[PDB]
Design a protein around this ligand. Structure first.
Ligand code: PLG
Ligand code: PLG
Lengths: 462, 99, 99
C-alpha cells in the first residue's frame, strides 16, 4: 500500500505524465488559435483554484440548514454565499426571487426545472434548433425520432424565426401556442443574434395559460451587466449555465419567482418544487467544488470590470459583424445585439461544414449552424472567449480578416476540387495557403494574454 | 561597404583619440562574457525577471505584455491610479532604485 | 594596437561571429556616440530614419520630437525621424503598422 504522499500528495506531472502532457498541449492549443465558439470562454485562475480543491471530497445531499448528513458547517456557508451572490449578480430582490445552484450543468438545470413544474408528457414549446434554439428546449427529427430528453419525456413543439427577416416571428408563435396549448414556453437560445421581447412572451404565455421560462445560458454575463433585456422582469423561471458569457465554472442555476403573485392573494409555488426536483428527484450529492468556484465567478461578475467586459463583448461582435459585412458577406438579420454573429454562407454556395473544416485546420474554431430556419448553410461566431483574452474592436476586425482569408481559400478549393466532400478534402492536403494562414493565426494568437494559469510555466511555448 | 564608412565616421569624423583604458577594460569584459559562468548569469537574469514579474502579477499588478522575455519588467501603474513619479520617489527613499 | 586588436577579436567571439562576415569598431565613447556614428557612416544629413517610439519602449537616440514639434534627440535634429509603435492592445511591436 503506497504511503499517503506517494499516491495522494505527488503532483500530476509525476503521478500521470500522460495526462499532464495532454493538458499542457491543450493549454498551448488554447493560446495559439482563435476561439470563436460562442459558448466557450476562459475562466479565471481563482475560479480554477476553487474548482480543483478539497471541496470535491464532501457529500452534502440536501440543501443548507437541512442536510441528510453532518459536517456541513462550511459547505452550507459556501452554498449560501453562492446563492446570495447569484441573486446580487442579477440584481434580484431576495424576497421576490430564489435560486438553486446545485445543477451539474445547464442541461441538468433545464430538465430539473421541467421536472419541477411539469408532469410527464406535458406540452412545451421552445425555439427550433434550425432557428437558433437549443437541444434541451425540445428536438425531434422529420422521421419522428425523439432526440432531446425534453422531447422523450414531455411533448414539445418548436417555434421558428421568420424565414426572410431571421427575427422571431412573434405572431406565428402566438398562433402556434393557442393551437398547441403548452404548459411551458421557453425563450432564450443558442444561435439567435438579437435580443428577446420578453414582454411579448409574457403576453403570449398569459393568453394561453403557460408558464414562461427563459434559458439565458448564452447571454447570462450580458444579462448580469445589464447590457441586454433582463428576462427576470417577465419570466417565471430563469435557467442558465455558468461557464459561457458568465465566465465561470461549468455548472447550472435555476432562478425562480417567490413571494406573492402580481395582480386572490395567490403566491408563487416554484421554490419547493424546484429544490425537490434537483434533489432528491434528479441529482445526488452537489458538486461542492463547482459551487465554490461558481461563488467566485459570481463575485467577479458583480464587479465594474465585468460590466466593461460585457460591453466589450457586444462591441467586438458588432465590429466583427460590420467587418464581414463590409466585405459583402451576409449576416442573419444583418447584424447583432449580443455576443454572436450568424454568418449566412449560402450566397457563397458554401456549406457551413466546409468553412468550419478549413478554419479548424488554421486553428480557427467556429461551428456550422443552420440559417433562417432552413446541410447547414452558415457558421456561428461568438466574441466572449477572445474578448476575455483582452481583444478589442480592431483585434476582432483582424479576426474578420482571418475569416475572410479562410473563406476565400474555401471558395478557391471548391472552385478547383468541387463541391463534393470527397473531392473538397483533396484540396485540404499539403496546401501552402492553409499552412500560411495557420502560421499567421498562431503568431497572432500568441500575442494575447491568457487567464487561468501561469503563462511563463507552460510546458509548450512554440 | 560598411567597414570603411563606419571606421571613418568614428574617426576622424566624430571622435578624437580612443579612450584606451575603456578599450582594455572592454577586452576584459568580453573575455568574461564568453565564459560558461556568463551564460549561466544570463539565464539567471531572465529567470529573475520572470520570477519578479510573476510575483507582482500575483499581487494584482499589471505588466506590459503580461510578462517578460528578457531582463526587465514594465509595470503599468495607471490601473492603480498612480504615477511613475510617486512610486520612483517613494522607494528611492527606501533605497530601491527604479525608474 | 594589440589591446584594441584583442578587444575586436574578443567582441567577434563573444557574439559568435565569423570575421569574414562581420567586423567591429570598439572606439565609441558610449552607446549614444556609437549610434550617432553608425548613422553618420551610412546616412546623409536629413535622411529618413524610423525607430521605436519612446512611449512604446524606444530610446532617445532612435529619434524623439515632441507633440509641439521640438526636436529633442540629435537623431531628430540631424536626420528626419518617424517613430513606430507597439500594438495598443498587446504591447508587442505592431509589425504590420510598421510595414
Ligand atoms: C449506489 C449509488 N448510485 C448512485 C449514487 C449517486 O451518486 P451522485 O451523488 O454522484 O449522483 C449514489 C450516491 N449515494 C450517496 C450515499 O450513499 O451517501 C449511490 O449510493
Ligand atoms: C584643440 C583640440 N580640441 C579637441 C580635441 C579632441 O579631443 P578628444 O580626443 O578628447 O576628442 C583635440 C584633440 N587633439 C589631439 C591632438 O592634437 O593630438 C584638440 O587638439
Amino acid at each position: 500500500m503506497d504511503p499517503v504522499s506517494v499516491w495522494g500528495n505527488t503532483p500530476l506531472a509525476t503521478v500521470d505524465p500522460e495526462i499532464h502532457d495532454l493538458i499542457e498541449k491543450e493549454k498551448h492549443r488554447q493560446c495559439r488559435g482563435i476561439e470563436l465558439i460562442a459558448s466557450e470562454n476562459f475562466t479565471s485562475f481563482a475560479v480554477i483554484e476553487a474548482l480543483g480543491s478539497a471541496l470535491t471530497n464532501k457529500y452534502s445531499e440536501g440543501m443548507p440548514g437541512n442536510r441528510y448528513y453532518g459536517g456541513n458547517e462550511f459547505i452550507d456557508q459556501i452554498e449560501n454565499l453562492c446563492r446570495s451572490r447569484a441573486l446580487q449578480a442579477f440584481h434580484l430582490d431576495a424576497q421576490s426571487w430564489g435560486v438553486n445552484v446545485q445543477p451539474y450543468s445547464g442541461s441538468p438545470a433545464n430538465f430539473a426545472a421541467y421536472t419541477a413544474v411539469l408532469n410527464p408528457h406535458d406540452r412545451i414549446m421552445g425555439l427550433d434548433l434550425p432557428s437558433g434554439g437549443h437541444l434541451t428546449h425540445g428536438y425531434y427529427t422529420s422521421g419522428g425520432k425523439k432526440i432531446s430528453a425534453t422531447s422523450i419525456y414531455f411533448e414539445s413543439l418548436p417555434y421558428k424565426v421568420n424565414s426572410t427577416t431571421g427575427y422571431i416571428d412573434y405572431d406565428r408563435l402566438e398562433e402556434k401556442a393557442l393551437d398547441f396549448r403548452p404548459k411551458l414556453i421557453i425563450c432564450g437560445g443558442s444561435a439567435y443574434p438579437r435580443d428577446w421581447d420578453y414582454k411579448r412572451f409574457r403576453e403570449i404565455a398569459d393568453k394561453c395559460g403557460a408558464l414562461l421560462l427563459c434559458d439565458m445560458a448564452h447571454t447570462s454575463g450580458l444579462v448580469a451587466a445589464q447590457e441586454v433585456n433582463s428576462p427576470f422582469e417577465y419570466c417565471d423561471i430563469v435557467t442558465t449555465t455558468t461557464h459561457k458569457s458568465l465566465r465561470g465554472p461549468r455548472a447550472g442555476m435555476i432562478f425562480y419567482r417567490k413571494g406573492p403573485k402580481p395582480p386572490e392573494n395567490a403566491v408563487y409555488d416554484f421554490e419547493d418544487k424546484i429544490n425537490f426536483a434537483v434533489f432528491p428527484s434528479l441529482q445526488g450529492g452537489p458538486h461542492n467544488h463547482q459551487i465554490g468556484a461558481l461563488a467566485v465567478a459570481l463575485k467577479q461578475a458583480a464587479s465594474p470590470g465585468f460590466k466593461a467586459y460585457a460591453k466589450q463583448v457586444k462591441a467586438n461582435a458588432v465590429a466583427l459583424g460590420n467587418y464581414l459585412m463590409g466585405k459583402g458577406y451576409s449576416l442573419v438579420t444583418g447584424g447583432t445585439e449580443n455576443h454572436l454573429v450568424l454568418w449566412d454562407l449560402r450566397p457563397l454556395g458554401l456549406t457551413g461544414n466546409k468553412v468550419e473544416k478549413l478554419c479548424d485546420l488554421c486553428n480557427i474554431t467556429v461551428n456550422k449552424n443552420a440559417v433562417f430556419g432552413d446541410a447547414p448553410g452558415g457558421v456561428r461566431i461568438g466574441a466572449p472567449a477572445m474578448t476575455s483574452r483582452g481583444l478589442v474592436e480592431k483585434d476582432f476586425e483582424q479576426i474578420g480578416e482571418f475569416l475572410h482569408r479562410a473563406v476565400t481559400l474555401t471558395l478557391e478549393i471548391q472552385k478547383e476540387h468541387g463541391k463534393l466532400l470527397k473531392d473538397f478534402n483533396k484540396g485540404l492536403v499539403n496546401n501552402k495557403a492553409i499552412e500560411d494562414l495557420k502560421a499567421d493565426v498562431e503568431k497572432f494568437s500568441a500575442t494575447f494574454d491568457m487567464p487561468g494559469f501561469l503563462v511563463s510555466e507552460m510546458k509548450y511555448k512554440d
